Structure 1
Amino acid sequence: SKSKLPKPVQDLIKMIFDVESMKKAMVEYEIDLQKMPLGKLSKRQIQAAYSILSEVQQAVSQGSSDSQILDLSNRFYTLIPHDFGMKKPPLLNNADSVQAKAEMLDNLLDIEVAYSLLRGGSDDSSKDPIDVNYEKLKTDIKVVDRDSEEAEIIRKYVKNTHATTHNAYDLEVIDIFKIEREGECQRYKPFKQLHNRRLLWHGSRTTNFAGILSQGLRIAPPEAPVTGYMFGKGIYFADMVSKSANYCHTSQGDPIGLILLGEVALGNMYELKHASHISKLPKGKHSVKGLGKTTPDPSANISLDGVDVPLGTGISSGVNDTSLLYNEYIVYDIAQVNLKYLLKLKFNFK
């Protein structure tokens, strides 16, 4: 309203700093907001909860001392307070359950970063809250024009890598933002020397984007479980928009999601057809490529700004005996990522 920014950037700001969305996420996790309000989330409590889920997972893998598991499960729920209403707390006693609680803590941490940013500052200004909260992201955000080559390439990227199989949605690009986080340029400069820099997708929940833009994509901490990281704790990317879009966790409820395009300096790829928890790459390798059954057609590889864009249609790869439908790319150093675009997408569920 009293803001200098174009309306798409303003709506982006409202969307990622939306306190109702934060509380709704907590309510949907069935968190007791009387015992743990949005405003009283702590990094230290969440780090301790991460550790417990790691111990839970260890206890599962060894051989359930069924009461020590229940003792760990109870300790988790004491630390992170829940209100399940009529049902009982679901026992944390398998991999899928540990992973869901870990995803919840990831979400909670970024929500806490968003809320601390929102309440931080002096809390009185001549400028309106949109411009002021825009500033706290430490990210220059510009609208890419629909009639530019970048918008066209990016829209083609979305079109061709929308996997018309197990897709319950058509995808529509509403806005394209060009983004530059403070310090990404200098942190990334050495890695610009690596060969094989690619423009790749990274999806995440909308309530995580205030944290992602202020802090960059991060690697899960040591305390957190490794369950569900097919290739260890790193930063994950796809060359198929629908693979990453699944990580937006968008529902028929909220059919709007945010997805990143990152330039990532892959270098020599450690190529793998099966899960393998990576803690250090072999010498000479700078990334992991999970080998999918379907890969973008290399004929239609193109470039913008010297970064390769694999927007080719999904064809067959020469890889039998793989656990993966689509490729994944993983780097283990945060400085190997340069976030270049942020898309607001509408999911049209069929």
Structure 2
Amino acid sequence: MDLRVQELIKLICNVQAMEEMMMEMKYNTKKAPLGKLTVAQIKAGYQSLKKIEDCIRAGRALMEACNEFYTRIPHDFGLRTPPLIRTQKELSEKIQLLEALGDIEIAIKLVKTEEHPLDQHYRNLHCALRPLDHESYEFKVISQYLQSTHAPTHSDYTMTLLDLFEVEKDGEKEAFREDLHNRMLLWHGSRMSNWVGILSHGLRIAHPEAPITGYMFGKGIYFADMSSKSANYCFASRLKNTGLLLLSEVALGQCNELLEANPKAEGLLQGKHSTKGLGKMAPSSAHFVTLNGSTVPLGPASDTGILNPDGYTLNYNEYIVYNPNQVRMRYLLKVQFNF
């Protein structure tokens, strides 16, 4: 490759990192190594999670259900009683875990070699990654957007743009809902473990067997107009301060705008093309710009005056599309997190 693209590839294709990351989520790799991971294993996971969600919707069976889960998706809690899976946060953790294994299952297949390995990993992605000049117009806007939509309540770090690549995933230009109005350039963040999957298969909706209570606005692909909302889903740390952020063209269409969580939001569409969870603070439109016919919601964020008298109010917006054909990957940011 070019060196910058080589180091990116190195970075995301590091299986030792993937292993470290999974141990950090308390997954037992000694017992179920990542190289012995299969689609069937991971479905078995979902099927046992579904059975747990069932017990929370209904009311004993939960101990049977949690055990089956831990049998099929081994964990490592050491000498402590393995905890039960009982709260919304807990179940959503288990889903973040399984998603991640699916992306690793994918990476491990892909990183197998027959050319230099890094050049092989790269080719098998089927997605052009192109480093951009830091003096260029596109880098200017992206930096401004990165910083200017850093949310005031994600004050625990800053981000530094280390490097920028334009992304072009085979298939996407053509599949894309070019026709839909309301097209915006929006963020997506994810665990480092997941990039080989996302680059090679694209952003995907939730797995079919995934429990729906995990998903605030149902099983779509989620985006923010607030860089740090997305960046939080990188799960970076002082120990692992290099992450990646995605910018994608998102064909939003008419938005069904929602004040609070509804996992059945997808059936609420009834003609519309996306869900938008309304936030307290959002970038203001007097400040937007256009990059290749996609609106870029430049910061800073302002009180939108939005309020949910019924309960919890979102701090910042989110957008959910329920078909990959509404997403076109566009730029990938290499970001240093400064804690």
| Band of TM-score, shorter chain | over 0.9
Aligned equivalent of 2:31: 35
Contact 1:196 1:265 in 2 (8 A): yes
Alignment of 1:20-169 (within 5 A): 20-63=16-59, 67-119=60-112, 121-122=113-114, 127-169=115-157
* More displaced 10-residue stretch of structure 1: 25-34 or 95-104: 25-34
How far off its partner does 1:318 sit?
3.4
| Contact map agreement 1:300 1:310 (CA 8 A) in 2 | yes
2:170 is matched with: 182
Q: Distance in 2 between matches of 1:83 and 1:266?
A: 41
Aligned twin of 1:264: 250
1:151, distance to aligned residue in structure 2 (A): 0.4
How much has 1:228 moved relative to structure 2?
Answer: 3.4
TM-score (norm 2): 0.96
**Partner secondary structure for residue 262 of structure 1:** strand
Q: Deviation of residue 229 (structure 1)?
A: 1.5
Which runs of structure 2 are paired with 1:299-318 in the superposition (5 Å)? Answer: 299-318=286-305
CA distance in 2 between partners of 1:9 and 1:45 (Å): 33
In structure 1, C-alpha distance between the alignment counterparts of 2:268 and 2:335, rounded to whole Å: 34
SS in 2 for 1:315: strand
Q: Secondary structure at the match of 2:111?
A: helix
Gaps of 5+ in 1: none
Q: For residues 196-207 of structure 1, what are the structure 2 equivalents within 5 Å?
A: 196-207=182-193
- Counterpart of 1:240 (choices 219, 223, 226) is 226
Residue 289 of structure 1 aligns with an amino acid whose one-letter code is K
Aligned to 1:251: 237
1:291-306 correspondence runs (5 A) = 291-306=278-293
- Partner residue of 2:197? 211
Shift of 1:222: 2.3
Note the alpha carbon deviations across 1:23-69, whole angstroms, 9 max, x for none.
Answer: 11232233333331121001111111112111101101211xxx210
Residues 137 and 58 of structure 1, relative CA distance in 2, 3 Å threshold? same
Contact 1:57–1:94 (Cα < 8 Å) also in 2: no
1: CA distance, partners of 2:302 / 2:70 = 46
* Structure 1 contact 57–95 (Cα < 8 Å) conserved: no
State the SS of the aligned residue for 1:193.
Answer: coil
For residue 246 of structure 1, what is the amino acid of its counterpart?
N
Mapped partners of 2:139, 2:75: distance in 1? 44
Q: Deviations over 1:142-195 (max 9, x none)?
A: 01111111000000001110113342001111111101000011111xx11111
Deviation track 1:243-267 (CA, whole Å, cap 9, x = no partner) reads 0001001111101111100100001
Q: Note if contact 1:17-1:118 (Cα within 8 Å) is conserved in structure 2.
A: yes
Pick the aligned partner of 1:345 from 314, 335, 339: 335
Q: Which residue, 284, 298, 313 being the options, matches 1:323?
A: 313
Query: Partner residue of 2:10?
Result: 14
**Across the two proteins, how many residue pairs are aligned to each other?**
335
Q: CA deviation at 1:281?
A: 4.2
Among all aligned residue pairs of Structure 1 and Structure 2, give the percentage whose two residues are the same amino acid.
47
Question: What SS does the corresponding residue of 2:167 show, helix, strand or coil?
Answer: strand
The CA distance in 2 between the partners of 1:55 and 1:78, in whole Å, is 14
Quote the residue 1:282 is aligned against.
Answer: 269
Q: Does the CA-based 8 Å contact 1:289-1:327 persist in structure 2?
A: yes
How far has the Cα of 1:203 moved from its partner?
A: 0.4
Distance 1:30 1:242 in 2: 25
Cα distance in 1 for partners of 2:305, 2:284 equals: 12
